[PDB]
Amino acid sequence: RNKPGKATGKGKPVNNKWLNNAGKDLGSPVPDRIANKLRDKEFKSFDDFRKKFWEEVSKDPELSKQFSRNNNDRMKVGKAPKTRTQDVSGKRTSFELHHEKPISQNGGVYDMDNISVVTPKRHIDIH
Amino acid sequence: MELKNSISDYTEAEFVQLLKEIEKENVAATDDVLDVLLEHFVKITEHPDGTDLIYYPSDNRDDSPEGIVKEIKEWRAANGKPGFKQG
Ligand SMILES: [Zn+2]
């Protein structure tokens, strides 16, 4: 879908409730521990990125422990974890990767500091 | 597969089989078949938690197909709803 590139960003620090409850808003950042693994790497398309983003998320012993066994299996193959029934909208039932600065204005497709994880209800809302 | 339209057509061993099918479709390339079985599990169990029973298990039970079955039995019996087939 998109064009290749190298992931960049510092990521942000998160606790052991990364997605569940947030200390800030209804949007969760790219764990700095994760950003450190995808930094300076090229991905054929942003989907290739999200695919690997979730993979690493399942390799981290601290964040994975916060997901069920089923949600863990999903991320291991590169799929976004399922949300809770109350955060689902339509057929979208998985966590989504949003872009702070549209690929339009200043792009920044792999700018890990430009990407935040959100729920459909939210993404659809913040649109 | 052999999808029954009621929880009482399912024996416990059979419902546990449907949970492994879901787990299997859980790691497949797409969520096409998985999302279909999940809508069925949701409709035959009638639990208000929905898919959460699979992806967001209650800390008061095991995160396993047995733990899932238990919660459905308990909630169904406690609400006066027919259970799993006997045979
Ligand atoms: Zn967006």
* Number of domains making up chain A: 1
Whole-number Å distance between alpha carbons of B87 and A33? 51
**Chain A residues inside the 8 Å CB shell of B29:** 77
Q: Which of A80, A72, A60 is nearest to A11 (CA)?
A: A60
Q: Which two three-digit tokens encode residue B86?
A: 């006997």
C-beta of residue A98 within 8 angstroms of C-beta of residue A113: no
SS3 A82: strand
Q: What is the DSSP letter of B63?
A: S
Catalytic (active site) residue A127:
yes
**Chain A residues inside the 8 Å CB shell of B55:** 68, 70-71, 81-82, 84
A127, amino acid identity: H
Count the neighbouring beta carbons within 10 Å of the beta carbon of residue A6.
11
Whole-number Å distance between alpha carbons of A37 and B81? 50
Say whether B52 and A94 touch across the interface (CB within 8 A). no
Q: Which two three-digit tokens encode residue B33?
A: 């078949």
Q: Which helix (H) or strand (E) holds A115?
A: strand A115-118
* Dihedral (CA of A106, A109, A113, A119) sign: positive
C-beta of residue B36 within 8 angstroms of C-beta of residue B26: no
Whole-number Å distance between alpha carbons of A30 and A111? 10
Q: Which two three-digit tokens encode residue A28?
A: 């969760």
The CATH number of the domain holding residue A12 is 3.90.540.10
Q: Which two three-digit tokens encode residue A8?
A: 């960049």
A97, amino acid identity: L
Q: Which of A77, A81, A94 sits opposite B27 (nearest CB)?
A: A77
Q: Which of A33, A39, A41, A35 is nearest to A15 (CA)?
A: A33
How large is the angle between the packed helices B12-26 and B65-77, nearest 10 degrees?
Answer: 130
The alpha carbon of residue B33 and the mean position of all alpha carbons in its chain are separated, in whole angstroms, by 15
CA atoms within 13 A on the CB side of A78: 10
Whole-number Å distance between alpha carbons of B23 and B51? 12
Say whether A70 and B64 touch across the interface (CB within 8 A). no
Catalytic (active site) residue A50:
no
Q: Which of A95, A82, A102 is nearest to A122 (CA)?
A: A95
Q: Is B82 exposed, middle or buried (0-12, 13-18, 19+ CB in 10 A)?
A: exposed
Whole-number Å distance between alpha carbons of A82 and A64? 14
Whole-number Å distance between alpha carbons of A74 and A63? 14
Catalytic (active site) residue A84:
no
Q: How many residues does chain A have?
A: 127
C-beta of residue B18 within 8 angstroms of C-beta of residue B6: no
C-beta of residue B78 within 8 angstroms of C-beta of residue B68: no
The domain in which residue A20 lies consists of 1-127
**Ordered structural domains, chain B, with CATH:** 1-87 (1.10.1200.20)
Q: What is the DSSP letter of A84?
A: -
Catalytic (active site) residue A122:
no
C-beta of residue A76 within 8 angstroms of C-beta of residue A63: no
Say whether A68 and B63 touch across the interface (CB within 8 A). yes
B53, amino acid identity: L
C-beta of residue A67 within 8 angstroms of C-beta of residue A99: no
Whole-number Å distance between alpha carbons of B37 and A29? 32
Resolution in A: 2.3
Q: Which two three-digit tokens encode residue B46?
A: 């009638």
Q: What share of chain B is helix, strand, coil (3-state, %, to 5)?
A: 50, 0, 50
Contact A120/B at CB under 8 A: no
